[PDB]
Every structure is written in C-alpha cells, then in structure tokens.
Amino acid sequence: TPSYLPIEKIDITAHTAHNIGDSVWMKNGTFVVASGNQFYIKDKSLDLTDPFTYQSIGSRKILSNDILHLSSVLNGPLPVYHPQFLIQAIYANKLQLVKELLLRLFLALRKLDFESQDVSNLDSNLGMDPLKYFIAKDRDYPVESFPDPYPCFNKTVSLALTEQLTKTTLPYLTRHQQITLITVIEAVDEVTKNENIVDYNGVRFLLGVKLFLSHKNIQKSILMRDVSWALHSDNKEILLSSIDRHITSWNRAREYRIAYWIKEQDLVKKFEDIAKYEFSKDDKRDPSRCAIFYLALKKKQILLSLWKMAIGHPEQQKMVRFISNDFTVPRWRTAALKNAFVLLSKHRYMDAAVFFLLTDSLKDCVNVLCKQVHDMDLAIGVCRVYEGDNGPVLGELLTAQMLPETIKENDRWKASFIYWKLRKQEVAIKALLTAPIDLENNSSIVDKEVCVNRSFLVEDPALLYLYNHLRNRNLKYFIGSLNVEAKIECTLILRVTDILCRMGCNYLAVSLVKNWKFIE
Amino acid sequence: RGTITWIAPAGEYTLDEKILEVEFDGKKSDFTLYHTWPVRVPRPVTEKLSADYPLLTGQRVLDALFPCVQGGTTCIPGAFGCGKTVISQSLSKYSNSDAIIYVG
Amino acid sequence: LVSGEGERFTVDKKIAERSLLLKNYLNDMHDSNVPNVRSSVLQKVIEWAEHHRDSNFPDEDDDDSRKSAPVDSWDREFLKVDQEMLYEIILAANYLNIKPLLDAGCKVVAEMIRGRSPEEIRRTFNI
Ligand SMILES: Nc1ncnc2c1ncn2[C@@H]1O[C@H](COP(=O)(O)OP(=O)(O)O)[C@@H](O)[C@H]1O
Ligand SMILES: [Mg+2]
C-alpha cells in the first residue's frame, strides 16, 4: 500500500476561475482557502461522492464521517480485534492473549445483540486491561475465566464467532480484513489443538501456512518467514504431518517449500511419494517426470523397471538400453555426461539433470536444476536427499546461486537460512539483524551501491522475534561479545518498534521494549 | 561440452587467439572464434519445425502462383537459356533471407 | 558512564546507584574490582533519577503492587513529552534494569495508546 492516501479533493475551482490565494488549516481540520476577498472554508466533514473519499474509506464502517476521524481510522492504533493485530500478537509470544481477545470479542458481540444495540458501539479495546499486553512470556499470562455459558475460548466459541462475524460487519474493518479475521479464528482453533505438542515456532509456522492458504491468488508460496519459523522448530514432524494432506504433487511440495525445512528422514519419504504421484499424473504414465526423484534417492533400479513397464513411450527403447549399464565404468560415466550435455543443448533441461545425476555428478545436476530449470526448491531437495542434510555440495550451491541474489535483494530470512545450511550458526543468527551485505566480507560479492536501499528496506518485526529465540538457545556464541551485540540489538529494537508503531500495533511495541532481555 | 573454465573479455581478437576454455571430464579444451565442421555431416538441431513463412522473391509469378516458404526446397529445371541463373541471382538479390549462400 | 555521542554527566552519585545495572557495573564493590543509551534519553533518565532521589519504591518485591495503580502525576507530565521518544526511554530503563521508570513509562504509554483509540478520541477530544 502507499504510505499516504488522499482523502479529499477540495475543489474550489468549481465556483470561480480565480486561483487559490492562500490556504490554511485551523482548529479541528477547518481548511480555510482564500481567493480575491472571498473565502471557501471547508469543515472537517467528508463528501462520500468524491472518488478520493470513496476509495480511501473503501468498505470500512466509521463512526463519524470526518477527515480527522478518517485519518484516525486509516492510521493510529489498531482495534485490538484487527487481524493485523492478532497475527502480530501471535508472532509475538502472546497466543493466550489472542485467545482471550477473541473470547472477549465474542462476549461483546453477544452483549450487543442481546441488548439490540448497534455493532458500531463495540469497544475497540474490548475492555482489556492494557497491562495484559505487556506480559513478558506466554506461560506467565494470567488466563482468567469468564462466567459459565462461555468460560474460555474453545471450539464452541470459535463456531459462534464465525457465525457472528458473518451476521455482522465489524467497524473500521474492510471486508477483506474481516475475512482474514475469520481465518485467524480458524488458525487459533488449529493452534489450540496443536498447542500442547509443537513448540511456539510451530505455532507461528501453522498460522503462517493457514494465512497462506487464504492468499494463493497473490502469494505463490509460503514466505521465507514461515520456512524459517519451521526450520528452527523442534517439531518439524508435526508441522509436516499437518500440511501433508496438501502435498500431493511436486507443485505443492514446492509451494510449502518442504525441501528447505522438513527433516531429511521425512524428505526421503516425501520424494518417494512425490515420485509415485508425478509418475501417475493425470495425463499418462511417463518415467520422464519421476526420474529425478528416483535417482536422487539412489534408486536407479526402480527407474529402470519404470522405464521397462512403460512400453508405449517412444523413448522407452533407448532409455532401457542405456540406463541398464553400470555407471561406475569410466566409459559409461563419460557416455552419460555426454548425453547429459546433449540434452542440455536440445533444451531438455530436466532430462539433462537426470542424466547428470545418473553418474553421481551432483554438482552438475543441481546447477542444471537451479540455473536452467529454475527450481532452487528441487535443487535443495536433491542435495539434501542424495548426499546429506548439510553440505558440502549444498553449501557451494547456496553460496554461489542464492547468496548473491540474497545480498542484492537485502533479504535476511534467506541469508539466515543460507548460513544455517552452511552450518555457520554463529553468523546465521547474526544475519537476522545486520544486513547481508555486511556479513562475512559479502561486500566482496556485490558493490554496496548495487544493493536495494531507500524506502524499499521495510523492516520485519518477526525477524527480531526469531533472533531473541535463537539468541537464547545458542548463548554459547554470544557470551564472547556482549557490548558489540547490544550496540545493534538496541538499534534494531528501536527500528522494529516504529514499525510496530507505524502498523498500529503500539501495544506490542511497548511490550517488545519492556520485556527485551539484554544478555548481561 | 563442459564448464566454462575461462571466457575472454570484450576486445579485438584474431581468429587464432583463444577465446574460451571449457573443462569436460577434467580435460580442458580451447575454442577460438571459429571451428571446423565436416561438410558431409548435417549440423544438429533441437527439432525440425514446419516451414510456414513465404520466401518472398521479387517475382510475381513465383510469389503468387507457385510460392515458396522459408525452409523449403525448390527446383528450377530448364533448358540452356531459359533463365535458371537469372532467377537464382534475382532471388539472391531481393529475397527475405538474412544470408545468401550462392553455390555455382 | 556517559554516552559517547557528546554525552556526559555526574560520574557517580546516590542517583546513579538508583540504576540496578550500575549497582554492579558502576564499580560497585570496587575493592573486589551507558554505551547503548542515547544521549538525550540518558539525560532524561538521570533527570528522573535525580527527581526521585528522595523517594522509595517496593522494587520487584511489590507483588500486587508495581502495577495496577495510578502513576505519579509529575512522572506522568515528565514522560508525556514525546510519543516517539517514550519507547526508547522505556528501553533505556530496561537496559539499566531500573524498575520504577520502566513501570512509569509503560503506564504512560499504555494510557496514551488507549486514549488514541477512535472511541476515546471522540469521547475526550470533541465531546
Ligand atoms: N528475368 C529475366 N529478365 C531478363 N532477361 C532474362 C531473365 N531471365 C533470363 N534472362 C535472359 O536469359 C539469358 C540466359 O538465361 P540464364 O540466366 O543464363 O539461365 P540458364 O542458365 O537457364 O540458361 C540471360 O543472360 C538473360 O539475358
Ligand atoms: Mg544454369
């Protein structure tokens, strides 16, 4: 969205051809305009026929029709039920608080309906005590109870809320924001079920994917934020089993970026299943598609059998006669390399990667997968299943193909992931705070002026919440240097606030500054 | 085939100066600005397409009545003074072709 | 003992002992043996410490206290001088481990944000 949005076009020209003489705001938004000896004082109300006012107000509902009130709706603290506040209170370790706010929202809506009062009377803070937002830790939250008919947030309250939110239009919320609020209710319902199993980097990932499902129109794969939430979770098995139902095809194992974070011991099984599916696609049986998954696993024999049973395919006779050889033989190794480089010139990139993997030249299979096929997701998967979980070919691939673009794009999620897969944990944790161009002589990769800068560098509060997690688990790497680390923690805390404040979550900014623990 | 071990920078090079080094199976090969090809072996292509664009000569009869396409094969039988060579040269002059190989 | 960006102050005093960080990092127990804080906010914090030099607080041992109570009016007016600087004043009070200023800043900023909601704006600003 633009940082500024027009809300009125005071068109004095519609009455006189004389140019505006002078313009001056005054008390309560009164905008006095002068021309000749003749003033055009406009009050702070709004004319809904204007295209600017109509577009800025959008679908919202506002108590007063004012430029002052409108400018206090498009900006300023969020109502505590706003979806952008609830997801940000979930990313911060305040899930219990979000559950309580949803319960209070239900109670307030029932109160309004029972008294037949208009919903616009709904309290923005839902009668919450502000100190609740400042509680340092999720398990220290005083989760009080309510009267018997609905004592604590649960499935019944969830369904009642999802009904009410369709039977009423919450104030200040564009209908799309209300849809995302309903999806947040569903996500909290899911988390409450899994809340007893997955640590809280599992809860953040679960909400990330549940929000992804509602935005497949504009979002083509879970952000690297969610991949990094899951990558550092201790319960990757639970997350994978929760999103498994959606991973039927490779195109859906590439949306959830499973190759990045799922455990190698599950990535092997997922390649087996994805090979099964990719073979028996909608069209017909074709061992060409599932070749890479079966070779990466080192199951050339299954691929050979697959080619054999594919009697109808035109390529069958050549491939059965070729693949059956033993590619430890130098002559056949060179023959397979030659065929791989021929297929790279006949524009058959996937087959070139397959052949480059027959001979165990992984460094050439993964470079054909990430550079000519454009699947870094599949390259990482093949690296992780074929050779091992972390490096050595994966390290070179990431440092060559991903690190430069990450530095140019100034992306710190990718940089942290890369320095994690290189098992450079001590600097992988630091890459979350300091920009990639300043890490490990990365300035040698690209000139500092080529990198993105200016307003495009919008912070990401979650990026800090991850650090405070890793920083606390990997203290061994931070005891050696405290003053230098604090010098940048105290900068990124004040730069993460001032976006938590610019995105309306002031209550979370105060919590972040209040509760941050400096490692003395 | 192979992995570019070295690629020359922009500048003026004679045909004999090395321009590229490429390693395949640990063996390094050197490539200049030219290469030799057996004239009796056809040069490979990824796939053979279907010729669908006209070979617009300058001749009304050949363009309208008996058109040829880019990538087609045509023959011009005739006696010893009916213009097989004048047609050939007019085509070499005014055809759409980006390059002409005139074989006598 | 003072911020490097042109920041200076009384090297030590009964006030500087108010900061529980300086209770150990201010050469406390010298017989047995600031960088982060911004200059202006450092001045503000020492002003608050000097003002309360003649007061006492229950510290973390307040149990039910240390919260759920109105803030001192002078502290209210003193901190309510800048919305953007109040967060970094809270962060400074956090780094120095000074509980009373932290509590006061959190109360003040919580009330600011609560009073910025549209309902409170209409109920207290124009009505
Ligand atoms: N399109 C033409 N316009 C004018 N004269 C032509 C044309 N085509 C052929 N001729 C004449 O015919 C002569 C003999 O034809 P030539 O081009 O040698 O073909 P061929 O090799 O079949 O004999 C040419 O030298 C020229 O004088
Ligand atoms: Mg002739």
Give the three-class secondary structure for B4.
Answer: strand
Q: Is it true that the peptide bond before A392 is cis, omega within 30 degrees of 0?
A: yes
Residue type present at position A494: L
Q: Which of C84, C106, C119 sits opposite A124 (nearest CB)?
A: C119
SS3 A42: strand
DSSP element (H, E) containing A363: helix A362-371
Annotated binding site of B for ATP: 78-85
**Pairing mode of beta strands B3-7, B27-31:** unpaired
Short-list A429, A386, A379, CA closest to A401? A379
In contact, C36 and A486? CB cutoff 8 Å: yes
Give all chains having 3 or more CB-to-CB distances under 8 Å with chain B. Answer: A
Residue A370, chain C, CB below 8 Å: the answer is no
A81 contacts A181 by C-beta, under 8 angstroms: yes
Query: Which CA distances in Å does A427 have to A260, A433, A434, A473, A478?
Result: 19, 10, 10, 14, 10
Using the Cβ of C114 and the Cβ atoms of chain A, whether some distance falls under 8 Å is answered with yes
The range of the structural domain enclosing residue C124 comes to 1-127
Q: What is the bridge-based pairing of β-strands B27-31 and A38-39?
A: unpaired
User: How many structural domains is chain C composed of?
Assistant: 1
Query: By CB neighbour count within 10 A (0-12 exposed, 13-18 middle, 19+ buried), where does B36 fall?
Result: exposed
How far apart are the C-alpha atoms of A95 and A86, rounded to whole Å? Answer: 9
CB of B58 shorter than 6 A to ligand 1: no
Residue B104 CA: which ligand is closest? Answer: 2
Rounded to the nearest 5°, which phi and psi values hold at A82? Answer: -65, 135
Beta bridge partners of A22: A34
Nearest CA to ligand 1 atom 23: B81
Q: Say yes or no: A514 contacts chain C, CB-CB below 8 A.
A: yes
Q: Does C14 touch chain A (CB under 8 A)?
A: no
Query: β-strand A22-25 against A31-35: which pairing, if any?
Result: antiparallel
Question: Which atom of ligand 1 is the closest one to the Cα of B85?
Answer: 17
Q: Where is chain A discontinuous (C–N over 2.5 Å), named by the preceding residue?
A: none
Question: What CATH code is carried by the domain that includes residue C104?
Answer: 3.30.710.10
Return d(Cα A32, Cα A213) in angstroms, integer: 49
* Amino acid sitting at position C30: H
Count of Cβ atoms closer than 10 Å to residue A489 Cβ? 23
Q: How was this structure determined?
A: cryo-EM
Q: Are A169 and A178 in contact (CB under 8 A)?
A: yes
Interface of A to B at Cβ within 8 Å reads: 334, 337-338, 341-342, 344-347, 364
- DSSP label at B83? S
3-state class (DSSP) for residue A31: strand
d(CA C90, CA C107): 10
CB atoms closer than 10 angstroms to residue A154: 13
Q: What residue of A is the nearest CA neighbor of C122?
A: A69
3-class secondary structure, A157:
helix
Question: Chain A residues with CB inside 8 Å of C101's CB?
Answer: none
Q: Is the CB of B101 under 6 A from ligand 1?
A: no
DSSP string, A206-267: HHHHHHHHTTTTT-SS--HHHHHHHHT-S-HHHHHHHHGGG--SHHHHTTTTHHHHS-HHHH
Residue type, C101: L
Contact A208, A226 (CB under 8 A): yes
Ligand 1 atom nearest residue B89's Cα? 17
* Pairing mode of beta strands A22-25, B27-31: unpaired
How far apart CA A397 and CA B32 sit, in angstroms, is 30
Indicate if ligand 1 lies below 6 Å from the C-beta of B85: yes
At A78 the three-state DSSP class reads coil
Alpha-carbon gap, residue B90 to B62, rounded angstroms? 12
Question: Residue C90 and residue A69: Cβ atoms within 8 Å?
Answer: no
CB of B67 within 6 A of ligand 1: the answer is: no
Q: Which of B22, B25, B27, B48 to mutate to test the interface with A (most CBs of A within 10 A)?
A: B25
Residue A480's CB is within 10 A of a number of other CB atoms, namely 9
Burial A306-315 (b: 16+ CB within 10 A, else e): bbeebeebee
Residue A378: which of A480, A254, A264, A487 has the closest Cα? A254
DSSP state of A45: B
Strands B20-24 and B3-7, bridge-based pairing: antiparallel
- Integer Cα distance of C31 and A306 in angstroms: 81
